[PDB]
Design a protein around this motif. Structure first.
Motif, mmCIF file in Angstrom:
data_model
loop_
_atom_site.group_PDB
_atom_site.id
_atom_site.type_symbol
_atom_site.label_atom_id
_atom_site.label_comp_id
_atom_site.label_asym_id
_atom_site.label_seq_id
_atom_site.Cartn_x
_atom_site.Cartn_y
_atom_site.Cartn_z
ATOM 1 N N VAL G 125 49.238 12.198 55.115
ATOM 2 C CA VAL G 125 49.782 10.905 55.515
ATOM 3 C C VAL G 125 50.432 10.164 54.352
ATOM 4 C CG1 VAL G 125 48.047 10.771 57.294
ATOM 5 C CG2 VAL G 125 47.697 9.550 55.150
ATOM 6 N N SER G 126 50.171 10.571 53.109
ATOM 7 C CA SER G 126 50.873 9.989 51.974
ATOM 8 C C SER G 126 52.159 10.738 51.662
ATOM 9 C CB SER G 126 49.970 9.970 50.741
ATOM 10 O OG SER G 126 48.862 9.114 50.943
ATOM 11 N N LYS G 127 52.127 12.064 51.697
ATOM 12 C CA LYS G 127 53.305 12.880 51.444
ATOM 13 C C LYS G 127 53.625 13.641 52.725
ATOM 14 C CE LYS G 127 51.637 15.365 48.161
ATOM 15 N NZ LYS G 127 51.521 16.287 46.999
ATOM 16 N N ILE G 128 54.365 12.998 53.623
ATOM 17 C CA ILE G 128 54.588 13.587 54.936
ATOM 18 C C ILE G 128 55.960 14.250 55.050
ATOM 19 C CG2 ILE G 128 55.259 11.305 55.800
ATOM 20 C CD1 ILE G 128 53.816 12.180 58.437
ATOM 21 N N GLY G 129 56.958 13.782 54.296
ATOM 22 C CA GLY G 129 58.254 14.433 54.308
ATOM 23 C C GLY G 129 58.287 15.741 53.556
ATOM 24 N N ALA G 137 50.987 20.913 61.506
ATOM 25 C CA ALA G 137 50.195 21.282 62.666
ATOM 26 C C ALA G 137 49.024 22.167 62.302
ATOM 27 C CB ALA G 137 51.052 21.988 63.704
ATOM 28 N N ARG G 138 49.086 22.851 61.164
ATOM 29 C CA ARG G 138 47.919 23.567 60.673
ATOM 30 C C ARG G 138 46.884 22.611 60.114
ATOM 31 N NH1 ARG G 138 51.879 27.507 57.558
ATOM 32 N NH2 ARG G 138 52.099 29.173 59.118
ATOM 33 N N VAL G 139 47.324 21.601 59.363
ATOM 34 C CA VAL G 139 46.388 20.619 58.837
ATOM 35 C C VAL G 139 45.810 19.785 59.964
ATOM 36 C CG1 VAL G 139 46.093 18.858 57.075
ATOM 37 C CG2 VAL G 139 47.708 20.646 56.757
ATOM 38 N N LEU G 140 46.569 19.573 61.031
ATOM 39 C CA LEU G 140 45.980 18.967 62.217
ATOM 40 C C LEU G 140 45.015 19.922 62.906
ATOM 41 C CD1 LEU G 140 45.953 16.400 63.694
ATOM 42 C CD2 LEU G 140 47.811 17.187 65.100
ATOM 43 N N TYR G 141 45.287 21.224 62.853
ATOM 44 C CA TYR G 141 44.353 22.193 63.412
ATOM 45 C C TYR G 141 43.107 22.320 62.553
ATOM 46 C CZ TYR G 141 42.723 26.823 64.957
ATOM 47 O OH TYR G 141 41.973 27.880 65.393
ATOM 48 N N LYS G 155 47.987 10.264 64.407
ATOM 49 C CA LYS G 155 49.067 9.312 64.623
ATOM 50 C C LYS G 155 50.264 9.640 63.745
ATOM 51 C CE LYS G 155 46.580 5.210 66.207
ATOM 52 N NZ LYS G 155 46.221 3.792 65.917
ATOM 53 N N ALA G 156 50.016 10.017 62.488
ATOM 54 C CA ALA G 156 51.106 10.339 61.576
ATOM 55 C C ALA G 156 51.756 11.664 61.926
ATOM 56 C CB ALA G 156 50.607 10.365 60.138
ATOM 57 N N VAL G 160 56.083 12.845 63.661
ATOM 58 C CA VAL G 160 56.870 14.022 63.325
ATOM 59 C C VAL G 160 57.200 14.849 64.561
ATOM 60 C CG1 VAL G 160 56.961 16.026 61.799
ATOM 61 C CG2 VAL G 160 55.730 13.983 61.111
ATOM 62 N N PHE G 161 56.279 14.948 65.513
ATOM 63 C CA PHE G 161 56.497 15.830 66.651
ATOM 64 C C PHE G 161 57.465 15.242 67.664
ATOM 65 C CE2 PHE G 161 51.970 17.305 65.708
ATOM 66 C CZ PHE G 161 52.443 18.186 64.763
ATOM 67 N N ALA G 162 57.719 13.938 67.599
ATOM 68 C CA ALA G 162 58.694 13.310 68.475
ATOM 69 C C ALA G 162 60.090 13.265 67.872
ATOM 70 C CB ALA G 162 58.246 11.889 68.829
ATOM 71 N N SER G 163 60.214 13.440 66.556
ATOM 72 C CA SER G 163 61.509 13.408 65.887
ATOM 73 C C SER G 163 62.051 14.808 65.621
ATOM 74 C CB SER G 163 61.402 12.647 64.563
ATOM 75 O OG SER G 163 60.931 13.506 63.538
ATOM 76 N N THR G 164 61.299 15.610 64.884
ATOM 77 C CA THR G 164 61.748 16.919 64.449
ATOM 78 C C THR G 164 61.538 17.925 65.571
ATOM 79 O OG1 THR G 164 61.075 16.308 62.209
ATOM 80 C CG2 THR G 164 61.528 18.620 62.602
ATOM 81 N N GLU G 165 62.524 18.789 65.782
ATOM 82 C CA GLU G 165 62.331 19.935 66.653
ATOM 83 C C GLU G 165 61.393 20.930 65.989
ATOM 84 O OE1 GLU G 165 63.340 20.678 69.731
ATOM 85 O OE2 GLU G 165 62.613 22.748 69.730
ATOM 86 N N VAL G 166 60.319 21.278 66.687
ATOM 87 C CA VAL G 166 59.331 22.193 66.147
ATOM 88 C C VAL G 166 59.355 23.470 66.973
ATOM 89 C CG1 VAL G 166 57.947 20.161 65.578
ATOM 90 C CG2 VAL G 166 57.232 21.652 67.460
#
Lengths: 30, 103, 40, 51, 290, 176, 441
Positions: G125-129, G137-141, G155-156, G160-166
């Motif tokens: 959440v500090s270095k997200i770009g 999605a692995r760190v979320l997993y 939330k962070a 990303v999942f609504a902006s970037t195509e994954v």
């Protein structure tokens, strides 16, 4: 190698009673 | 022996050699044993000259003449002028001295 | 005989588990009948 | 280990140069063990030379 | 065989001699056998006692499959050891240890009306130098009330105690305001997770420091047992350990037909198999069928 | 491991860091041309993108084959690593057999030779009881039953005082 | 020139020597997944033995080891959870590519290390770009399966999942992480469901979004069920049960998919009935009754018996807030049916505990003639962790199986039930819940 089987429960929540250091490392150095 | 590892027989046997290196005396008589490389060269040479029935008695005296004047080796080095009195020579002196005081 | 298994060898041996079971087979039927026969 | 132990120990025990001689190892001791008993005969001879 | 209340405790369990009791039961239901009706009986006393003696058949083999991290450096072998006891208690049906001892406090003292009674009916479950440290605070607050403090919360005298009872808890080292704001929740989940991530750094520092204090007692027991044993001659040790092995085989060989003793001697014969299997091929270990 | 994993030839290791294994993979967009070499052997096969994903379908589930138990082996391994620390200070003992000669016998006070011949007999007492490694298995069985009865608690196996204190302030400082 | 059983003996001799370093134990593990060596268990044990004994660890050999343990499907908890020490000490030394492999492999194994997952999610959440959407999605997993309910990462990751195509693979990993967290933010779930426009390269990510959609109860996307009728030979039987169950929870009617998914499971159950865990046999009885696709005659009755076990074992190991809610709902459903006094409820709540037709125990089972209602209480553990707090898909799983046995399940959610101030209002909640389900009562 085998130990007596016990069937008893621990009712209390206590500190695990760290035993005192034996004198063997310095008496063998004596 | 290190804390987690195992001992090897290449180091257990190196330790056993250090034990048996203390079993050698610090100063020893080089009492010479006759090998069969030189004692079977003298037996057939006795059979060369027909005395093969007394070939063993030549080989027994062959070892003995090296054995009575056997030299004292300290660390493999021969110490010259090393005089020692036997336990059997010193027990001849006592039995001479006991039998001439008893008389 | 030799070369037993894996799931036979994975069990810890001298745990209690059967003193606890032997107590639980002799405490539970002997205290289920105590509660159905109890008046002060 | 015990097979190399009975082989290396007999290697130094089959050697007759490894027979420990106290007369060779300690010359000043094995001559004083003699004169312990030669002094006891000398003390028994002084009592005969006095008589 | 199982009495179906064992096999329900062994479903989510993971150890060996219970899962081969489940796999043998799951093969029997597949072969046209009907499942026993689970009894909705044995009211609250017998129901909570069978949970005591069925969870201890899940904990007891599970504790023996958890390698202690003795003589280890770091906090990760203690966080392994504690997490193996967290996941073991969960398989035995326990909840979180915070949830399970807070249930133990409210069970002991549902009818404690005074704060000196809640400090003496939860005496076995609180650290004794913390229970005594709440008695100087109870005796100090008793001076300004000169009446027994009640276990109310709406009483002003309880807030005079809890003003100084919280003062000890921060001095003991535990953040009481992050504990209390975790179990109260919060409004937004964004600032509910700022207290969740500060409770769980206390809790991870809580469950480690008493898993480590449980290890450092075993390290000091094994070092005092060994140093009592290294002072003996080797002939005394060989006959002291031969009598204890003889008297404990004899205790299991007198009891015949009992389930625990005939399972005890199957373990002695399986220890001897391990020594006999290693003796056949010692650079590879015991032989597994694979 | 969980039922579904999401790893394989995506951010995968393409090169080995050791010399005893030399591994190089060729990341095709669909598949991967792997070649690994370990000493004299060479293995060069091809794996697909969906062949690494089926690898974690069935789990290995490594389990320890211990002689008595995994708990008991962890106490015996500690006693063995303690019995090594005491063996290491019997290794630094001075060689008394370099003074067994009769020129050390007869120079010495006769009571300081009884003490020296008993100090050598004490080393063989200490050394033969620290190399009695068959005694350590029955020592670890004196630590197991007191430990396992502490884990057989009525509260929790993992409970201790620090969790129970912090769950007392949650209990006390809330309104009864 | 090309021998695998002769290179395994060269790896087996590599990890059997006494001084196996960290780099050599990593590369022996990497070489065993690229060679697919599931059949040799001891060779995987010798690498996992030396992986814990290794004391040096740098950022690349730890990451190659954890990748190999995760990809190879190798679980040993003692070794892997002790690799969190090299993970937490090298956590500033880790690449964002490598930190996603560390937390996913430690997270998926179930390592309970909060100091790792707090410090790894505070990095993201500090270095997200710097974090690519596969590395987020692995760190979320990882943090989802490490037992952490970290929403500040969820939330962070939602931004990303609504902006970037994954990718399809990293969407299913993000969905599976959300279903374990239980969030169901529809702005982010369907933002991850627009990633099934390319198709799935594997079935394990078609099944992992299948399970994650039914667990949050959205619906099937029908590009996901299109992959599952075609790629259901790419799944283990434990993976196909979780594939079919999450479809039936989401309302999937394509019975040709359920014929494909049960054609993986049901041949495996006949040769080994004991190979699947009983919690997955109960997931199959949910999947075969909601979709209605029948099983073999020996399997479908056995999987019906195993729903009685896994519902009973979840009753014995009850959370004691589910015990205190069932006895609170059974009190509020006793006074709803008419009980003015304390001795009248206590004999009524003991009469509600009739047994199910499969041998199970139902806590609140009422019968009027031939009509049966069941009352279900769902505490917080089966509720979604977000603000509307709707129950998860696993309770419609239990209701729709109990309805097919002759019951009418009225769900009583405890965020609504314990919101009521009084007991008679709690009776006005339960009696309103029963009549909106079965109006005969």
């Amino acid at each position: 190698y085998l130990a007596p089987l016990r069937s008893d429960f621990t009712e209390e929540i206590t500190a695990p009673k760290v035993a005192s250091a034996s004198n063997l490392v310095n008496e063998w150095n004596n | 022996w290190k804390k987690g590892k195992t001992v090897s027989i290449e180091n257990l046997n190196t330790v056993t050699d250090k034990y048996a290196a203390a079993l050698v005396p610090k100063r020893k008589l080089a009492l010479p044993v006759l090998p069969e490389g030189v004692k079977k060269a003298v037996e057939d040479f006795a059979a060369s000259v027909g005395q093969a029935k007394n070939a063993s008695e030549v080989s027994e005296l062959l070892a003995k003449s090296l054995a009575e004047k056997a030299v004292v080796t300290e660390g493999g080095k021969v110490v010259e002028g090393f005089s020692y009195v036997s336990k059997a020579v010193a027990a001849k002196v006592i039995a001479t001295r006991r039998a001439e005081v008893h008389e | 005989a030799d070369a037993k298994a894996l799931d036979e060898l994975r069990k810890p041996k001298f745990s209690s588990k059967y003193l606890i079971q032997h107590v639980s087979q002799k405490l539970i039927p002997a205290v289920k009948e105590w509660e159905k026969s109890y008046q002060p | 280990y015990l097979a190399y132990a009975v082989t290396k120990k007999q290697e130094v025990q089959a050697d007759p140069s490894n027979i420990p001689f106290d007369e060779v190892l300690y010359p000043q001791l094995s001559e004083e063990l003699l004169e312990l008993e030669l002094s006891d005969i000398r003390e028994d001879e002084i009592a005969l030379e006095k008589a | 065989a199982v009495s179906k209340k064992e096999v329900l405790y062994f479903l989510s369990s993971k150890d060996a001699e219970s899962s081969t009791a489940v796999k043998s039961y799951l093969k029997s239901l597949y072969a046209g056998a009907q499942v026993e009706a689970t009894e909705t009986d044995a009211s609250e006393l017998i129901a909570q006692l069978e949970k005591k003696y069925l969870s201890a058949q899940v904990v007891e083999p599970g504790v023996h499959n958890i390698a202690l991290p003795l003589g280890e450096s770091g906090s990760a072998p203690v966080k392994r050891y504690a997490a193996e006891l967290f996941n073991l208690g969960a398989q035995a049906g326990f909840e979180c240890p915070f949830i399970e001892v807070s249930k133990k406090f409210g069970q002991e003292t549902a009818t404690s009306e005074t704060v000196k009674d809640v400090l003496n009916k939860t005496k076995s479950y609180v650290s004794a130098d913390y229970n005594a440290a709440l008695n100087e605070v109870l005796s100090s607050v008793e001076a300004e009330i000169n009446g027994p403090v009640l276990f109310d919360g709406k009483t002003e005298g309880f807030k005079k105690f809890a003003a100084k009872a919280k003062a000890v808890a921060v001095s003991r080292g535990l953040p009481a305001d992050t504990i209390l704001a975790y179990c109260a929740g919060s409004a937004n989940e964004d600032a509910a997770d700022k207290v969740s991530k500060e409770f769980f750094t206390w809790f991870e520092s809580a469950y480690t420091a008493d898993a480590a204090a449980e290890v450092k007692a075993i390290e000091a027991e094994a070092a005092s047992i060994l140093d009592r044993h290294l002072a003996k001659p080797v002939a005394q040790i060989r006959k002291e350990q031969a009598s204890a092995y003889a008297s404990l085989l004899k205790r299991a060989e007198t009891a015949k037909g009992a389930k625990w003793a005939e399972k005890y001697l199957e373990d002695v014969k399986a220890v001897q198999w391990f020594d006999a299997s290693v003796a056949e091929a010692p650079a590879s270990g015991p032989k597994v069928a694979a | 491991l969980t039922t579904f994993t999401f790893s394989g030839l995506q951010d995968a290791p393409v090169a080995a860091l050791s010399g005893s294994i030399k591994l190089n993979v060729a990341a095709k967009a669909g598949k991967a041309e792997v070649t690994v070499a370990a000493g004299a052997a060479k293995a060069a096969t091809q794996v697909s993108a969906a062949a690494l994903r089926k690898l974690s379908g069935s789990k290995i589930s490594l389990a320890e084959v211990a002689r008595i138990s995994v708990l008991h082996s962890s106490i015996q391994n500690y006693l063995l690593s303690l019995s090594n620390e005491r063996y290491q200070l019997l290794s630094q003992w001075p060689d008394f057999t370099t003074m067994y000669g009769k020129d050390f016998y007869y120079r010495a006070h006769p009571e300081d030779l009884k003490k020296f011949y008993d100090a050598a007999d004490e080393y063989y007492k200490l050394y033969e009881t620290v190399t009695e490694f068959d005694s350590l298995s029955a020592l670890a069985s004196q630590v197991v039953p007191n430990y396992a009865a502490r884990r057989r608690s009525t509260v929790h196996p993992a409970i201790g005082s620090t969790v129970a204190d912090g769950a007392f302030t949650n209990f006390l400082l809330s309104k009864q | 020139e090309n021998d695998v059983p002769a290179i395994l003996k060269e790896i087996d001799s590599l990890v059997s020597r006494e001084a196996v370093s960290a780099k050599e134990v990593s590369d022996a593990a990497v070489a065993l997944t690229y060679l697919q060596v599931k059949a040799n268990r001891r060779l995987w044990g010798k690498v996992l033995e030396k992986a814990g004994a290794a004391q040096d660890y740098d950022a690349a050999s730890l990451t190659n080891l954890l990748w190999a343990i995760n990809t190879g499907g190798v679980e040993h908890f003692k070794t892997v959870a002790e690799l969190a020490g090299p993970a937490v000490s090298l956590l500033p030394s880790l690449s964002p590519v490598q930190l996603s492999i560390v937390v996913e492999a430690l997270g998926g194994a179930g390592v309970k290390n909060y100091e790792l997952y707090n410090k790894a999610s505070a990095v993201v959440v500090s270095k997200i770009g710097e974090f690519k959407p596969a590395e987020i999605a692995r760190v979320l997993y990882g943090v989802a399966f490490g037992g952490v309910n970290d929403v500040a990462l969820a939330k962070a990751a939602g931004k990303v999942f609504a902006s970037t195509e994954v990718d399809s693979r990293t969407a299913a990993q993000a969905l599976y992480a959300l279903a374990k967290l239980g969030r169901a933010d529809k702005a982010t779930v369907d933002a991850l469901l627009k990633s099934f426009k390319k198709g799935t390269e594997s079935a394990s990510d078609a099944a992992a979004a299948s399970f994650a959609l039914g667990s949050l109860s959205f619906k099937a996307e029908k590009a996901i069920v299109d992959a599952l009728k075609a790629s259901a030979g790419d799944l283990a039987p434990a993976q196909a049960v979780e594939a079919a169950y999450g479809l039936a929870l989401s309302g999937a009617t394509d019975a040709e998919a359920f014929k494909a998914l049960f054609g993986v499971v049901a041949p495996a159950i006949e040769k080994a009935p004991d190979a699947l865990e009983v919690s997955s046999l109960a997931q199959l009885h949910v999947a075969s009754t909601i979709s209605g696709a029948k099983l073999p005659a020996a399997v479908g009755s056995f999987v019906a018996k195993a729903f009685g076990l896994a519902a009973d074992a979840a009753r014995l190991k009850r959370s004691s807030a589910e015990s205190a809610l069932v006895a609170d709902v059974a009190a509020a459903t006793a006074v709803a049916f008419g009980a003015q006094y304390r001795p009248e409820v206590a004999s009524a709540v003991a009469s509600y505990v009739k047994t199910a037709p499969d041998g199970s125990v139902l806590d609140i089972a009422i019968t009027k003639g031939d009509a049966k209602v069941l009352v279900q209480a769902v505490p917080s553990s089966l509720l979604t962790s977000t603000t509307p707090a709707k129950p998860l898909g696993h309770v419609a799983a239990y209701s729709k199986v109990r309805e097919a046995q002759g019951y009418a399940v009225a769900v009583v959610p405890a965020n609504e039930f314990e919101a009521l101030p009084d007991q008679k209002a709690k009776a006005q909640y339960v009696l309103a819940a029963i009549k909106k389900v079965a109006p005969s009562f």
